[PDB]
Every structure is written in C-alpha cells, then in structure tokens.
Amino acid sequence: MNLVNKAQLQKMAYVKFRIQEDEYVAILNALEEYHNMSESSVVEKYLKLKDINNLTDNYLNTYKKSGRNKALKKFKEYLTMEVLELKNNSLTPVEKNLHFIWIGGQINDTAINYINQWKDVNSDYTVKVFYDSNAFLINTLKKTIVESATNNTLESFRENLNDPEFDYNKFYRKRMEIIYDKQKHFIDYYKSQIEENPEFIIDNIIKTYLSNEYSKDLEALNKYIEESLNKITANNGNDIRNLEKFADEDLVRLYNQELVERWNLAAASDILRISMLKEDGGVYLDVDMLPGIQPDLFKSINKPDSITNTSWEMIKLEAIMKYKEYIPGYTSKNFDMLDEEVQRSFESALSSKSDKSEIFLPLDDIKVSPLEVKIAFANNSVINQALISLKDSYCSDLVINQIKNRYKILNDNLNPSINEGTDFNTTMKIFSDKLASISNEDNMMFMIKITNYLKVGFAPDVRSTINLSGPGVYTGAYQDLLMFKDNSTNIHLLEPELRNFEFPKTKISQLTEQEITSLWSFNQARAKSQFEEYKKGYFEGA
Ligand SMILES: O=c1ccn([C@@H]2O[C@H](COP(=O)(O)OP(=O)(O)O[C@H]3O[C@H](CO)[C@@H](O)[C@H](O)[C@H]3O)[C@@H](O)[C@H]2O)c(=O)[nH]1
Ligand SMILES: [Mn+2]
Ligand SMILES: [Mn+2]
Ligand SMILES: [Mn+2]
C-alpha cells in the first residue's frame, strides 16, 4: 500500500518500443516530485496527488487505445490508496470543543439533560450549545400555519369521513396545497419587509405577522422569546448572532433559507454544524445522542443469546437510567423483559461505582486527520448525527462545497418555478419538468430525491434534506476526497470504504429513547397515527 516509484510505474506502463509521450512524462515527473515532498503538509501532499490523478486521465483521454492504459487505471487506484495512507498517518487530537444546536424555539429539558451527561463526563471539553437569538419563533410560526391548514382541510371533510378513499393520504395531499399557499404568503411578506429594512430581526417580522394574520398575542410571544433566551443562557448558550468572522455569506444565505422560509430546523442545523466545525473544530452531536458506555462495565455480563446486539446496547443504557437515575423518565421497558438474575447482574456492576466517569466513557483525545471529517454510522450507512473535524479541515470544505453545489441546482430551478406557478400543484409540475430537462446519468438520482423539497416537514416519507444538507453530502465529500473530484453526486463508494471515516464507536451511544423520534420528518405509520388524532379532535372538545 506504499505509493510506487517513478521507475516502478515505468515497469508497469512499459510498452516495448513506444515513444514516451509528453502526457506520460508529465505524470512521471509529478510522481517524482511527490516523493520529494515528504516534509510538506498533509493537505499539500493530497493536492499533489490530485494533480497526478488529473494528468493521468488526461493521458487516458488522449490515448484511449494506448497499451499503457490498463496499468495507468491501476495507478489511479494506488493514488486512492495513498490518500488513506496520508490520512491514517496524520492523526492529531481535535480541538476540545463540543457542539450542539438548538434553534427555532425554546430548548426542552430532555435535550439539556442529555447534554448535561456529556458536560459532566468531559471537563476538558468546552460545551457550546448554539442558538439563534433572532429566531425563537420559527416552530411557533410553522405550528400555526400547519394548524390552520389542518383545520381548513378538515372542514372540507365534514361529510365524507366514513369513506371511500378519503383516507390519511388524501388529507396530506390536500393539506399541503393549503400549507404551500399560506407558507408563500408569509415568505412574500418577510421578503418585502427585508427589502424595506435589512436590519429587521427575524422574530420581529414573525410576531408582526402572527399578530396581524392569525390573531396571536404580542405579549405572550415576547414572553416566550424572553423565557427561551433565559433558559439557553443558563445552559452554556452561544448566540450565533454574536459571532463575527464565521459567516460564509453563501452558507448564511442558505442557513436563512432553511430557517425562515422552509422552517426546516434540521436542515438549518445541518448547515450550521459543518460551518461551526470548520471555524471552531471539534465534535458535533445531536441533542438526542448520549455518551458511550465504559467497555469494562458490563463485560462480565454475557448477552442472552436470543437477544440482538442492538437491543442489548439499548438495554445497557436503560440499565444505567434505572439505578443511577441521571435522566428522569428514561424507558426501562426492554430492561424489564430480562430475567431477575440478569437484572441483578446489572444492579451488581452499578453498585460499587462512584463517579459518572466510571459509567460513561469520556471523550479524551480524539485523533483525526486534516484530510477528513469522522462521521457516525447507523445500519451500514453514514449518518451525520455525530461528526468530528479539526478546525479548517480539508474535508469540511468539501462538505461545504457539496452543500452549495446542490443548493445551486435546487435554487436555480426552484426559484423560477415558484415565480411561474399559481398554486402548489403547478409549481411542483414546473419544478419537476425543469429538473427533468437538465437531468442525466450522473445526477438523475439526486434530482428525484430533491423533487419533493417543498413538502419537507409536511408530508410522510419526504427525504430531500438528506441529499441537500445531510448524510448524502458527506458520502459525496468522501468520493470527492478519494476519487479526486469536486462534483461527486453519483455514489460508488461501498460501506467498507466509507468505514474509514467512522466516529469511534466506543465513544458514543446512538441508540437512545429520543433518537427513536424524528422532528423534521415522519414515516407512513406516524402519518396515519396522527391523522386519527387530528380527526378525533372534532368530536372531542370543549
Ligand atoms: O426544532 C428543532 C428541531 C431540530 N433541530 C436540530 O435537528 C437536529 C436533529 O434532529 P432529530 O430530531 O434527531 O432529526 P433526525 O430524524 O434524527 O435527523 C437526521 O437527519 C438530519 C439530516 O438532514 C440530521 O440533522 C440529523 O443529524 C439526523 O439524525 C437536532 O440535533 C437539532 O440540532 C433544531 O435545532 N430545532
Ligand atoms: Mn399583560
Ligand atoms: Mn475556537
Ligand atoms: Mn435524531
């Protein structure tokens, strides 16, 4: 897995009596100077490989029938290997910052209690919980608009309840058409106000809108902000509106897009986390992630063979929150399925244990490369609920560029679709066709997955965020890194190649209670589940 020499590569690509072409010589020279660079920075060493990989397929593009090509395709694979080598030999401990994000509303006690677990166990880490002091009223506003649409949709249902295909499917379809119109009425309002006075604060536009159009009480809203700001200050609150240099004005624009217009706090958070990791360095976590459990704790307790590796890891946590009681309310439903003598095997190991540090594994020194961003896995796929990156890392720029490039395709096609259409149905048809007209082999999948963007948060199985700002943008970045590209969208990296970038697994417990629920999306089950409730709030009332 060592990178071949000039002379060694020459053996590989040797064709008897063939002229040494300029494009070939160029490759060999450049490979020579890479091996005479060993003092340089990792990033600089990566960039030299990237030029070497560009000179190589220039050769291949030039001589498509050259008897050198086979060997040179293999060379390209060794370049890929060399990246992993540079990565694996450039590890260094991350900045000891620990990031969380809660925006668009008041932080709940459930999040703070999960966060506090991290704080207690990591003295040497600066816990920062980013919030947006200008935007406490996003969730409120969406809750009101969604509310109004639900109701209107249900009034056009008051004599069709029992059948036929007025099921939960038709409810969302038709609710969405109303949500879109109402949402657009607000956006148009917000946008005209910002033209008026650019200094205007998001929440101030929001309250004026809520009081004028939906009869909300000004005072109640100002007290909600005041409380929300109070709570988060009390809890290591870092206001983003206080920071100066961080702002990538492009990212800020898209951060604002997801926060104010789309009301996707998860998307907004996807955007803010990578920006903060880049500027600050460290470890990012979702507020529903708990720390890793100490290896040796339950090592002497053998997993009952009829029980999954997953449920056991899940029990391991519930066992902690039964006896030690760090989080009040934490489920033990799975723990109670166990045999008495095994339940007492857990009481036994949790007996002679003093500090929370002997229970949860502290993060300590986490080693990472400048060339990478480490990421959590769930079900043999990356998931960005947990990230690690050095300040100003190369791969963070790749991630940020993936986001921008994807939003450029989105916005360039969506914005005019918004302007040309006269309702939800027409906008979606214009958007769908515009993406069709510019779709090809290398982006078709991406186009399909972002087609339903305007539906995010309002309808079941809507997953566009994943491929704009979430996991997809990381696997995209990893393909950029390994394959030497800047445009990766058609993914060909398999799990074991993606596993190079994994969050160290012993240093996180992903399988918590709060993770079971999602706040930006929902599946078909929950959709049906709460169609019943909304409907059942029409016979049951005051
Ligand atoms: O009102 C909200 C709601 C969510 N969030 C943020 O959203 C993040 C994740 O929310 P979660 O409820 O866990 O949604 P998931 O269904 O788990 O979202 C998945 O998909 C998203 C990718 O778009 C990622 O943000 C998440 O890491 C990933 O777990 C949280 O940590 C918060 O930072 C807010 O700030 N305010
Ligand atoms: Mn009063
Ligand atoms: Mn810093
Ligand atoms: Mn989650």
UniProtKB/Swiss-Prot annotation:
UDP-alpha-D-glucose binds at residues 101-103, 139, 265-270, 286-288, 518-520. Its cofactor is Mn(2+); Mg(2+). It is found in: Host cytoplasm, Host cytosol; Host cell membrane. Has higher activity with Mn(2+), but most likely uses Mg(2+) in host cells. Mn(2+) or Mg(2+) are required for glucosyltransferase activity. Changing residue 16 to I: Slightly reduced phospholipid-binding. Residues 96-468 form the GT44 domain. It catalyses: L-threonyl-[protein] + UDP-alpha-D-glucose = 3-O-(alpha-D-glucosyl)-L-threonyl-[protein] + UDP + H(+). Changing residue 20 to A: Slightly reduced phospholipid-binding without affecting cytotoxicity. Residues 1-91 are annotated as: Four-helical bundle. Mg(2+) binds at residues 288, 515, 518. It is a peripheral membrane protein. Changing residue 78 to A: Does not affect phospholipid-binding and cytotoxicity. Residues 96-468 are annotated as: Glucosyltransferase region. Consists of 4 functional domains: (1) the N-terminal GT44 domain (glucosyltransferase, also named GTD), which mediates glucosylation of host small GTPases, (2) an autoprocessing region that catalyzes autoprocessing to release the N-terminal GT44 domain in the host cytosol, (3) the translocation region that forms a pore to promote translocation of the GT44 and peptidase C80 domains across the endosomal membrane and (4) the receptor-binding (CROPS) region that mediates binding to host cells and contribute to entry into cells. The four-helical bundle region mediates binding to phospholipids, such as phosphatidylserine and phosphatidic acid. This promotes localization to the inner face of the cell membrane close to small GTPases. Active form of the toxin, which is released into the host cytosol following autoprocessing and inactivates small GTPases. Acts by mediating monoglucosylation of small GTPases of the Ras (H-Ras/HRAS, K-Ras/KRAS, N-Ras/NRAS and Ral/RALA) family in host cells at the conserved threonine residue located in the switch I region ('Thr-37/35'), using UDP-alpha-D-glucose as the sugar donor. Also able to catalyze monoglucosylation of some members of the Rho family (Rac1 and Rap2A), but with less efficiency than with Ras proteins. This is Glucosyltransferase TcsL. The chain holds residues 1 to 542 of 2364 of the full protein.
